[PDB]
C-alpha cells in the first residue's frame, strides 16, 4: 500500500543479521499478496563460502527470502496471535531456473492460499530483470 | 567403510565457511547411499539472527546440509565430470517435523534415486534425524552439474 | 537437572562468538556439573585456526570448561546477584588429544572450594571426546 | 565492456568485507566508468551503523566510488603491473541523501588526470544524486 | 579527564563493527578532542583490505576522526537530545603514511564553527602514528538529525 | 630495528583471523626471550560476546596471545623441524591480575626455559602494570 522499509520489517520479523533476507516491502495487501525485494551484494557473509571460485546465491536462501516475505504477509494479515515466531512446516515444488548473482535485484512475490486456526499455505516467485529465477508451489507455516 | 573427516570433505565440496554444513561423512556407498552428521552448536554465525529470542536451526540450512551430503555422494559416485560446483535444480516433498536446537547432532542420510550422465541430472531423497527421531524428510532433490 | 541453551543464556552473560556451552546434561549444586559442546566446522574460529587443518583452540576448551564451572557456581549460590564472573587463575592444564570438527566435547567440572560472598570459587575440570580424555584442568579459580 | 563480480576480483585486490562494487555496467578506458552497489540489510556494517536506524556509512560510499575509480585506472593503463592502489587524498565530498537497505547505489567516476591519477565521482539512487566527490587522488604502490 | 569505551557507547550510537574510537584521553568542550584508535590484526575489515597486505582503509581513518569529532559535538552542547549525527561533507583529506596493524592511531579533532540554530558543525582532524602525521582533514561538516 | 611486522608474523605463525593475537614483535633474542604487542580495540569480533554489558578481553585470549608469541620464539630459535603448527601441550600458573580493556596496548614477554617439548614463561603488561602471569607454557 504505502511502502514499508527495513526498520519496520524488523518490527514484524524476529529475524536479524545474518539471516534477515528481505530489504524492502514495496506492495502488501493483507490476506492476498506481498511484493518485496532483496538486494544481492558481494558484501554478504554467505558468498565467501558459496562459492570462493564463483559467487552464486544459495538456492536455499532464496527460499528463506520468500519464506520471510511470506511471513510478513501472515503477521500483518491477522495479528490476533501476537507471536511473530513462525516456523517453516513444509515446502513443495521448488524449482530454481537461473542463478542469482551479486549485483542483482531479487524481486519477490508470495501469495496466500489458505489461513486457519497457525496453519497457513503460500505460493512464491522471485525475479531478476523480469525473468523467473525461482518457483515455489507451496510454503506451509506454523506458529 | 571409512569415516570421512572435514579436510577430505573440503577436497570434495567447494563449500566454505559460513556455508559448509557437513562435519563428517560416516557411511557412504557409491551410486547408492550416504550417512553423515552436522554438529549443531550455539557458536554458529546464523543462530544470532534466527532467532535472538529463541535459537532454532533454519530448516533450509538442514535442506542445504542434506543437499551437501547428497552432493558428496554424486561426486564420489562418478567424477568423470571434474566439476564440483553443483547447483540445486529443484527440491520436492520437504516436511520439517521437529526443531533442530543447539547441542543436537543432526545425523543425515540421503539416497540416490536416479542419475543421468546426460546433463548432470541427479535425483535424491533424504532424511535428517536428531536422537533417532525424524526432524526432516525430503522426497526429492534435483541437482545439475555445471 | 536439564538446562537447555535458552536457559544457559539466562544464567551466563556470555554471547556469540564466545558462548561455549551448548547443553548442561547433569548438574548437582555445590558438587558437580556435566555439559557438552558441539564442535562443528561452522564456527568462526575454525577459519583462523587453522586454514590448513581445523583443530579447536586449546584455550577455548579451557573457556568452555570455565563457562560450565561458572554455571555451577551461579546455580549453587545466587545470593550474590552478579552473573559476570572473571577468570582469576588456572593451573595444571594439559591437552592430550586434538578436538576436531565433528566431535562432541563432553565436559565436567567439580567444585573444590567456595568462600560464599567473596566470589572465590575453585574447581577441577575434565573434557572428553568419545570416552577419551582430551583436556585436563587441575584448578580453575574464579572471582565474582 | 560490462564486468561481473568474478572478474572484478581479478582487477581489484579488495575482498570481504570491503569490496563495495557489485557490477561494472559501462567502462570507457581513460574516460569514464559506471557501476552499482547493492545496499542490502544483510551486510556486516549495518549491524553497527546504526542499531536504531540503518544508514549506509558515508565513508563507505566514498570507498565504493573509490574502488570504482580504482578499476577504471587499472583497465586504462596496466603497464604498472601493481593492483594495490592507495587512497592518497579526497576532496569536495558532499552527502545529500542517506542511502538505506534495499537501495541500488549507481556510481559514475570520471578520470581527470593521469601521470598519480585524479578522479571525480557521483552516486545515484533512483536517478537522484546521493553523493558528490569532486576529487579522489590515487597513488599506485 | 579520560572517557573509556563503556561511556563512549553512551555518547555514540555506533556499534560493532563500525565503532572506531577506543578511548578519549583529552576533551575540552567547544574547542578540542584527543582520542586513540587501536589498530589490531584481529579486526574484521583487515581480511578484505587487503589479503596480500594489511592496511587500515583511508576511509575508516576518516570515520574514526569524524566519530571523535562526533563525541566533541555531543558533549559541547546537548540541548539537541539527538545522538544520530550524519556526515554532511568532508574536505581536504590527505593521507601521508599507511596505518598498519600494531599502530596506535592517535587523533585530534578541533571544532571550528557550530550553529545550534540548524544542527551544523565544522571540524578539522589529524591522526598520528608515533608522533608522525598519517591523516589530515581540513574540514568535517556534520548534521544533527 | 630487531623487529617483526604483521606480514612477517603470518609467515612464521600459521594462525589467521579471527584467532591471530600478536600485532607486532618488537624485540627477539633466539633461545632466550621475545617481546610482542597485541592491540586491544573495540572493533574485535570477540567483544560483542564477552561481554555485551562490559567489554573485557577473555583471560583465555591473553594466554593464546602470549602462547603465539612463545610460538614465534621456538620457531625462529630452531627451524630444522620444518613444521609451523605448534600445539599447546599444557599451561601452568596462570594468574590474571587486571582486566584488559579496549584501548589498551597488551605488551607481552615470553621467555624460553627448556627445549628438547618446549617450556616457556610469559608476562603481559598494560601501561607497565602486570595484568597476566604465566609460570609455564609447554609446547609440542
Ligand atoms: O543449494 C545450492 C548450493 C548447492 O549446490 C548445494 F549442493 F550445496 F546444495 C544452490 C542451489 C541453487 C542455486 N541457484 O541456482 O541460484 C544456487 C545454489
Ligand atoms: O591453543 C592452541 C592453538 C595453538 O596451537 C597455538 F599455537 F596457538 F598455541 C591449541 C591448544 C591445544 C590443542 N590441543 O588440544 O591439542 C590444540 C590447539
Ligand atoms: Cl569466563
Ligand atoms: Cl581502497
Ligand atoms: Cl558518522
From TrEMBL, chain A:
Spell out the subcellular localization from the entry: Cytoplasm
Task: Quote a single Gene Ontology cellular component term.
Answer: membrane
EC number(s) from the headed UniProt entry: 4.2.1.59
- Gene Ontology biological process terms in this record: fatty acid biosynthetic process; lipid A biosynthetic process
Sorted keywords for this record are: Cytoplasm, Lipid A biosynthesis, Lipid biosynthesis, Lipid metabolism, Lyase, Signal
Per the entry, what this protein does is:
Involved in unsaturated fatty acids biosynthesis. Catalyzes the dehydration of short chain beta-hydroxyacyl-ACPs and long chain saturated and unsaturated beta-hydroxyacyl-ACPs.
Q: What is this protein called?
A: 3-hydroxyacyl-[acyl-carrier-protein] dehydratase
- List GO molecular-function terms, semicolon-separated: (3R)-hydroxyacyl-[acyl-carrier-protein] dehydratase activity
**Highest taxon of source:** Eukaryota
Chief subcellular site? Answer: cytoplasm
Keyword Lipid metabolism in record: yes
